[PDB]
Design a protein around this motif. Structure first.
Motif, mmCIF file in Angstrom:
data_model
loop_
_atom_site.group_PDB
_atom_site.id
_atom_site.type_symbol
_atom_site.label_atom_id
_atom_site.label_comp_id
_atom_site.label_asym_id
_atom_site.label_seq_id
_atom_site.Cartn_x
_atom_site.Cartn_y
_atom_site.Cartn_z
ATOM 1 N N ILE A 1 31.154 -84.418 10.902
ATOM 2 C CA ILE A 1 30.283 -83.582 11.719
ATOM 3 C C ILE A 1 29.676 -82.518 10.818
ATOM 4 C CG2 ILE A 1 30.193 -81.986 13.714
ATOM 5 C CD1 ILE A 1 30.586 -84.866 14.524
ATOM 6 N N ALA A 2 28.339 -82.374 10.830
ATOM 7 C CA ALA A 2 27.688 -81.460 9.895
ATOM 8 C C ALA A 2 27.248 -80.150 10.569
ATOM 9 C CB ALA A 2 26.549 -82.153 9.203
ATOM 10 N N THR A 3 27.360 -79.039 9.824
ATOM 11 C CA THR A 3 26.927 -77.735 10.315
ATOM 12 C C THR A 3 26.161 -77.050 9.192
ATOM 13 O OG1 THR A 3 29.121 -76.916 9.720
ATOM 14 C CG2 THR A 3 28.716 -77.251 12.069
ATOM 15 N N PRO A 4 25.264 -76.074 9.477
ATOM 16 C CA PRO A 4 24.587 -75.335 8.409
ATOM 17 C C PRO A 4 25.642 -74.710 7.499
ATOM 18 C CG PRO A 4 23.586 -74.830 10.535
ATOM 19 C CD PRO A 4 24.858 -75.611 10.817
ATOM 20 N N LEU B 1 38.670 -77.929 13.000
ATOM 21 C CA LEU B 1 40.004 -77.977 13.594
ATOM 22 C C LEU B 1 39.973 -78.816 14.878
ATOM 23 C CD1 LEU B 1 40.628 -74.176 13.016
ATOM 24 C CD2 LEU B 1 41.847 -76.022 11.844
ATOM 25 N N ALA B 2 38.922 -78.680 15.703
ATOM 26 C CA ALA B 2 38.792 -79.497 16.907
ATOM 27 C C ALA B 2 38.636 -80.971 16.522
ATOM 28 C CB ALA B 2 37.617 -79.041 17.728
ATOM 29 N N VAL B 3 37.791 -81.236 15.505
ATOM 30 C CA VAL B 3 37.674 -82.586 14.953
ATOM 31 C C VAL B 3 39.068 -83.046 14.540
ATOM 32 C CG1 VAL B 3 37.067 -83.774 12.767
ATOM 33 C CG2 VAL B 3 35.269 -82.799 14.199
ATOM 34 N N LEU B 4 39.772 -82.191 13.775
ATOM 35 C CA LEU B 4 41.142 -82.488 13.385
ATOM 36 C C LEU B 4 41.926 -82.907 14.623
ATOM 37 C CD1 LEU B 4 42.390 -80.005 10.634
ATOM 38 C CD2 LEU B 4 41.699 -82.410 10.458
ATOM 39 N N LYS B 5 41.945 -82.058 15.665
ATOM 40 C CA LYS B 5 42.710 -82.327 16.886
ATOM 41 C C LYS B 5 42.351 -83.709 17.438
ATOM 42 C CE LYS B 5 43.622 -80.787 21.039
ATOM 43 N NZ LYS B 5 43.493 -81.674 22.220
ATOM 44 N N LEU B 6 41.047 -83.997 17.605
ATOM 45 C CA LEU B 6 40.625 -85.272 18.193
ATOM 46 C C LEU B 6 40.972 -86.438 17.254
ATOM 47 C CD1 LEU B 6 37.227 -84.119 19.752
ATOM 48 C CD2 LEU B 6 39.327 -84.762 20.963
ATOM 49 N N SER B 7 40.955 -86.182 15.934
ATOM 50 C CA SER B 7 41.359 -87.178 14.945
ATOM 51 C C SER B 7 42.880 -87.353 14.961
ATOM 52 C CB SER B 7 40.869 -86.810 13.561
ATOM 53 O OG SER B 7 41.473 -87.622 12.568
ATOM 54 N N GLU B 8 43.622 -86.280 15.277
ATOM 55 C CA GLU B 8 45.078 -86.367 15.399
ATOM 56 C C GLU B 8 45.464 -87.328 16.525
ATOM 57 O OE1 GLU B 8 46.016 -82.209 16.005
ATOM 58 O OE2 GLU B 8 44.937 -81.778 14.125
ATOM 59 N N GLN B 9 44.655 -87.376 17.577
ATOM 60 C CA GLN B 9 44.858 -88.388 18.621
ATOM 61 C C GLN B 9 44.038 -89.629 18.277
ATOM 62 O OE1 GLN B 9 45.057 -85.096 20.059
ATOM 63 N NE2 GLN B 9 43.103 -84.689 21.065
ATOM 64 N N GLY B 10 43.075 -89.489 17.351
ATOM 65 C CA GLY B 10 42.189 -90.593 17.005
ATOM 66 C C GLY B 10 41.376 -91.023 18.219
#
Lengths: 42, 49
Positions: free
Chosen positions: B19-22, B33-42
């Motif tokens: 996911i890209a941000t400026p 961290l949210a990406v991490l969380k969702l990736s932790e559940q995959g």
């Protein structure tokens, strides 16, 4: 002719669909953990 | 469909869809961290299916 030709010239799915070859992982490993938690049906 | 396409061979290089941000985004880290969380559940992996 075909005798001649015939004389001139396996996946994770496969593992899952069988049990004859005791297939497994480290009993104490993240590999075991990968499977214990995988959200993939297979 | 029309199912007239097939992937053959391994990948010629390595690409990661992230996911890209400026540069230095305020959400940069919260979204990581949210990406991490969702990736932790995959969740992403089921969404693939």
């Amino acid at each position: 002719a075909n005798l001649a030709a015939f004389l001139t010239v396996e996946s994770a799915e496969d593992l899952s669909k069988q049990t004859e070859i005791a297939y497994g992982t480290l009993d104490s490993g993240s590999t075991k953990e990968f499977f214990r938690r995988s959200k993939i049906a297979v | 469909k029309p199912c007239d396409t097939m992937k053959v061979g391994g990948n010629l290089d390595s690409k990661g869809y992230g996911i890209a941000t400026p540069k230095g985004s305020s959400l940069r880290t919260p979204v990581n961290l949210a990406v991490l969380k969702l990736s932790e559940q995959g969740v992403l992996d089921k969404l693939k299916n």
